[PDB]
Amino acid sequence: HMDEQPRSSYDPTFFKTEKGVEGGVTSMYAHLRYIYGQAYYYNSCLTGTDEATWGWSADGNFKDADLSGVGNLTATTCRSDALWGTAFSNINTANGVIENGAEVGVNESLVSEARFFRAFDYFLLVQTFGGVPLDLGSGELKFNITPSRTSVRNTVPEVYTKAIFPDLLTAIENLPANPRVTGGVTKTVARLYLAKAYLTYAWWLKNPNNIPTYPECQRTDPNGHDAAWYFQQAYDVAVTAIENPGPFGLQESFWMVNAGPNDRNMEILLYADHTQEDEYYNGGSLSYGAPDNFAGWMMNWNYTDARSADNQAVINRIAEQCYGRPWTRMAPPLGVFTKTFADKVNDSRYDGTFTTVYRGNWSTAGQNWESVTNANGMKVKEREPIFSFVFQDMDKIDYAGEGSKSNLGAGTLPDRADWVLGLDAVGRYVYPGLWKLGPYRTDNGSGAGQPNAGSTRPYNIAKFSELYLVAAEAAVEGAATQAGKSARDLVNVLRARAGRWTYSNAEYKEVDRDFSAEMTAATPATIDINYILDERSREFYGEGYRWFDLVRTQKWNEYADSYVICGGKGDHNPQTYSRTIEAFHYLRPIPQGQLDGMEMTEEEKDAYQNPGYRD
Template sequence: MAGCHDILEETTRERFEPGFFKTEEGVVGGLTALYANLRRVYGQPYYYNATETGTDEYTYGAQADGNFQAADLSGLGIPDAQTSRFDVLWNASYAAINSSSGIIANATEAEMPAALIAEARFFRAFGYFQLVQAFGGVPLDLGGGILEFNTAPTLVSSRNTVPEVYSLAIFPDLVQAVADLEDNPRVNGGVTKNVARLILAKAYLTYGWWLENPNNIPTYPEASRTDPDGHDAQWYFQAAYDVATNAIDNPGPYMLQETFYDVNLAQNDRNSEIMLWADHTEYSAKYSESNVTGWDGGDAQNQAVWMVTWYFHTIKASADPATWSPVDAMFRTVQAGQSYSRMWSRMAPPIGVFTNTFADKTNDSRFNGTFTTAYRATWHYNPGRAENTLYGANFMPVGPNDRILSFLPSDPGGIDYSNTTFNSGTEAGYLPGRQDYVVPLTKISRADYPGLWKLGVYRQGSDYNDDKVASSRPYNILKFSELYFIAAEAAVKGANGSRTARDLINVIRSRAGKWRFDVAENQEKLEDYSAEMTNATPVTIDINYILDERSREYFGEGYRWYDLARTQKWEEYAGTYQISPKAGQDPVTVEREIEPYLYLRPVPVGQLDRMDGDEAYKTNYQNPGYRGGE
């Protein structure tokens, strides 16, 4: 980024003591640990599941275990204190919050540079903001006092209310961070004034919704929907708009990429649109915190995309042009590009994703730049395979990198799913005159569905061919584009300014109409449909349109549950979904039971087990709905 020349050097330490935070080396070391801690949340597969499964973006897949089935809320269980994978967020956040408090207290006493301390303020506020959205009111006193660094274990805890968390922790820290942070990052990927503005604007927006509470969603600990500072919801919507538009007008080193494709292209990682990421590298297991040459199962690995990748490696073709002699047409490799990540099939998109959210597949490049809909033969990446040609459906020849399976925009009719002659090894069928097997997007199943290209694994080096390795790409957390969405949503909620919600959304939609590359066709495509995209935008934007656009922009990135919870639209958007029992069969409608208490996630059982106190004390600590006997 502009103005940034230093690279983040990581030194692992088992613990930090107060005196260490009174030196600049200690402050920098503590901040480095805060950046590293992001890896334990973002890209972590079970937290990813918790933010996506059960929304309109994902249901459980064919290989889902109980964690994913329960998260779907469709009759196969309900997340509770033992099984809810929001425990990942709880456990990682409090370690970071306490370290942040240690840096703030001791570095302030030692008169360290304000900009360094402001980075810690950002991380403390960011941690609390994520927690309060998921759990409601959470503890501000970790044993040493309100927002104080705690150095001794404590077995007691008290939860603050939602207004207290915002007014005492989130807003003051972020306002101070905005004031003290520099425009340009201290290190590559470091937080800046505008990173703090993004979270401050989003916190204002979220708290405004909480105060308004349009669908009477319960909170805990119980608290009046009034603001300690005397502001109403409209004040916070206006504040969100003002902060977000100020950040847009003063971008610093950040800007939108020219095309949506460029935002998520692996070769363009850490681009100027990405404001914060959980970093990984393929060149060092130490700095990636995962094995870069194979499986190791650590808790800091980026494995999110595995969860949404189906078992495409089972696709077969024939070695003989006249008699079906099945061999593997696909080799599992990370060298073939972003489309071929390791597959676990834990999560699958419902059909509505393709018929509703991404209905426009012609003008809007975001469908093409989000999913893998064309699977191309990769057997030649296997050093043990020497065939130049295989034979697919209709015994038609298939060469390396040719299509072997495609997801069609609609059902043309006449697809043969019998697999009696051309057995694809999947649920897909075939059509006369095509060498590739086909599945209509209107009839996908939990086993056969488009993969998530945007998060796909990629290796820059050419010395490794094992798909078991976790993704060495950074996991994107915050994007400059979200400032436009925050301001637009605030405008829909009544905020006033020179830009309307339509103006702001059309910046994003205009960019979405610009094509540079066609992922499905694997070739350059220089087309500009920005006028068609902006002309199709409604004159009056409502919150549902904002949510639809957010899903098109951030599909599968871990935003969705937070978006639906903030706006209290979870039941409306995800109460039912459709999916086919088997690819090609007529879809069935599945109902979910999204009770109001589920808007708050359960406090993890590990937290309750570590606390002293009788059962009544622990019961009252837990969110209602997750208590034994309720």
């Protein structure tokens, strides 16, 4: 199906009221929870890129997505499919809110939230699937009540020009500076997504590596401007946001951006609010009776395996950000450590991304051991390092001896009271957990909390930081820059920020370091797209940006054609795996469910489906 949500003949009249417009608008905030935090969609944004390959416990969902000869990516197996029905349901709702609310004069500040969300949804769809329908059964961008059995896909430029740009431009004029409600949309997030949309369209027009689009359409803009024009607008709009940020801004340190106690901070422009839940009512009377934020489980592993020299289970599964529930379904390739996060001394970001030092928490399991013995018969207290992923003396580790006793493929080092494994020995079972998406719960007490519950944390969708990297990318592709905001200046803002350490996760303590001078100096004299993409991986690793960024820039092949990783536990042999990423893979399949739901001939269905996925 296309529209999941049920529609009443009175809905258009409902949306001629302010309370109806609010109703619709708040369901739009809700729709974010079915995408952002959803683990299988999350997969579709990351696996098969440089940031993620399949993990030891991987399903078809993750294997099929890696495009590495261990699965099949088809119209039934791509987890792009979570986006389709969710986005179109929301879009239809937005269509109703917008045509009826605007017709009657319902406050445009509020209506423009729906304008934003409609653009937002279409921008995800257009990148993911190519051209998609603007007509849902009642005309272009019109509210549809009774679902149609037939659909027609518009072209990419039609979606950008007809739906995405005009909505965002209007939204920017009318949206408030400060959020109306929590996580609420503002001028700044509308500007961000407009700049991104212009940036993405500009690349689409330029089409340097000749990746086909579907439906068939020529590489020119109905609005009549060239790629350069769009690159310039991307720059200008991003920069206008930076200069008029309302309440938003960068945190002092990169740790503060994704640290649990600082969720909902003013670097976050938009998020899915996973605390907010649904209240059922039956015929006016309360009835007892949400989707989960379980994306953080994918790039998290069985640290609970960790043992002492006396084979004691020293790490309990608990609801803390460094620990949390593991599904071992996605793993970081070694390129992440050797290329992306090369610098770990001057760069907060590696440490503000991965949990590297795993400590004992055994009293959460009801144990009362003062100390325990492991790692050359050394005593280790609670909350002290048991197992560390290291990047220093990697070629000295002794995996041959007592490291066996860890139940981790781990080894030892001299005068070192902790098990240890180097980043060149990372595998599909044992890898640094993704700390960004770990759970955060104040109500754990002295116990484990509820570690198998979905995360209650916001899932962060849009960040003030990205503005800098959107403008910088536009600058690299030829846009005319303003004084103090060259490509190099813009990149250096985020890099200077990255050199400021406020807290070390590895060391589990406050800290005071400023390596911003060093970071600024090590930035290349001139900036290429490769560097933008590396910075994007550093700032946004594992958050679900990667597939979009590599497809826009057409670097997906260059960055993902091969990855490097070791095997299961006790396998420290780094093997190179090669992917087969064809040009038609740059568009995801239309989900088979949509095709099956339509009254069409097999010929019409073949034509509806993107090339490569028709058999």
